[PDB]
From Swiss-Prot, chain A:
ATP binds at residues 15-23, 35. Changing residue 138 to K: In ovarian cancer. Changing residue 152 to E: In CRC; also found in sarcoma, metastatic melanoma, ovarian serous carcinoma, pilocytic astrocytoma; somatic mutation; most common mutation; constitutive and elevated kinase activity; efficiently induces cell transformation; suppression of mutation in melanoma causes growth arrest and promotes apoptosis; loss of regulation by PMRT5. It comes from Homo sapiens (Human). This is Serine/threonine-protein kinase B-raf. It comes from the Eukaryota. There is a cross-link at residue 130 (Glycyl lysine isopeptide (Lys-Gly) (interchain with G-Cter in ubiquitin)). Belongs to the protein kinase superfamily. TKL Ser/Thr protein kinase family. RAF subfamily. Changing residue 211 to K: Increased kinase activity and stability in response to EGF treatment. The modification Omega-N-methylarginine is found at residue 211. Changing residue 16 to V: In a colorectal cancer cell line; elevated kinase activity; efficiently induces cell transformation. Protein kinase involved in the transduction of mitogenic signals from the cell membrane to the nucleus. Phosphorylates MAP2K1, and thereby activates the MAP kinase signal transduction pathway. Phosphorylates PFKFB2. May play a role in the postsynaptic responses of hippocampal neurons.
Amino acid sequence: DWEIPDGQITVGQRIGSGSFGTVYKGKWHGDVAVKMLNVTAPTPQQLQAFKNEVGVLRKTRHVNILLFMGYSTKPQLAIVTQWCEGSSLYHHLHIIETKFEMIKLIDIARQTAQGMDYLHAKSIIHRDLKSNNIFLHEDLTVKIGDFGLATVKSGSILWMAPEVIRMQDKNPYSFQSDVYAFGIVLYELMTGQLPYSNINNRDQIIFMVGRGYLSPDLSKVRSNCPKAMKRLMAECLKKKRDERPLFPQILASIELLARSL
Amino acid sequence: DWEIPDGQITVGQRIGSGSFGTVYKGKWHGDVAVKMLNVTAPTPQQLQAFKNEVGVLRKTRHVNILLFMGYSTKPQLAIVTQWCEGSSLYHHLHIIETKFEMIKLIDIARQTAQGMDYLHAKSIIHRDLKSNNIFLHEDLTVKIGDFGLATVKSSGSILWMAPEVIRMQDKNPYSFQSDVYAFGIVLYELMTGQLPYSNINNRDQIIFMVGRGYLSPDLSKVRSNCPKAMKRLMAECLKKKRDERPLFPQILASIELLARSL
Ligand SMILES: OCCn1cc(-c2ccc3c(c2)CC/C3=N\O)c(-c2ccncc2)n1
Ligand SMILES: OCCn1cc(-c2ccc3c(c2)CC/C3=N\O)c(-c2ccncc2)n1
Ligand SMILES: [Cl-]
Ligand SMILES: [Cl-]
């Protein structure tokens, strides 16, 4: 089992928030990340998420997926993963303006696909892939996290495929919803910025993207962005679910992109 | 469940030998290390070794334990882990005589203790700790592996073998403290860049002597910048008497203090 008996985890500093709780740095057999639900009496629903996420996380063992290390139910519900030195992709790209070399950008991308291919072969849909959820350990290895909105067969507007934004379908979530999210992550990597920067109105972005009036301006990729890469982005950011590639194909594509650079 | 269906693992190069098998680089959701038993008809002793090692690795999820990813039963019996770009600590210290800095050597020791602490807490005895089984993922992160010989409470790798393990006279010759002696030898390698008993060329004699207590690692050979507390820890972990050796909670703290003062 992976239940860490109450008292073993040492909760240090509050880092931020996760799918269904607050993230703190912690100590359990070393440095760990701790995602804790702070309520005293967990709501049945809340408890449900914990169980789901944990059940989802028990089925992951991959270099590019945040290593779930265990869980805790008392004093409070908590999810313990490894600790990633550095920050999330969102942070690197949009807060501290880390300027990565293009070959490093393609590496980050390939790794994210490596992890997402893993997830999909396992019938896991992340349902909330964003830069905020892609952590770069030792500014080298990409690990994906926050698997609470995940599931097995948001406020994250910018990564949401138009059929998800529309929400006018049944589980508008698909391996392609994830693929679109990933394609937006690709935009961020090769643009250095967030989609739709020239619009200041969240509602407006939401509507247009949902009705297909708005799309990421791929004309902003850096000059060094392999064209193949621009074309792959386009394939992933297609406004029609079935016109988008799955992760084995995306992986094969990026790896070829790598052979020549 | 961790069974990987037939056909999904792509076996690449032969990388070397494992405890009960042959290690290859491979591909399964990315670069993976694969250890395969290269036999046609697997005896029940090897099927037992396999079910044992799978059972232990399932319980390991720690940055300093080599990431188990899954097992296959066809084409062959196999264990699949993450792929560690770099090489074993042994390779670095004795093959390419890599020159890590003390700060790094201490960090490598901290991480190996971190990994060792994780296992011993889940009641796992590694039973074959050695530089050969410590891999340097990106020359940064220590990943401990080869849990073939490992077991859960209730070889030919002599230099890491505690005296009582060499003798095989006591019951349960192996114990948390056997792996602490193994760790003590790994500390030695880190602090001398060297193998113990490097001036003796007879395996049988080294076995006998360490077994009787005639022989022990020369500690005056630690590098002159090795902190006094790291040498003191090294010798605590290397005490001939099993129960006079620390456990990894004490060991980790010690190193973590050494750190603060460096
Ligand atoms: O983006 C906000 C900052 N931030 C949030 C997390 C985080 C998010 C989700 C989850 C965990 C940690 C652990 C449990 C979990 N759910 O999977 C991290 C983090 C992740 C890994 N190592 C270090 C830090 N940073
Ligand atoms: O020592 C000879 C060289 N060598 C052996 C391994 C090895 C050893 C044992 C086991 C595995 C791989 C995989 C399964 C296993 N048993 O747990 C490795 C290695 C480990 C991790 N990443 C890259 C290489 N190098
Ligand atoms: Cl597991
Ligand atoms: Cl012992």
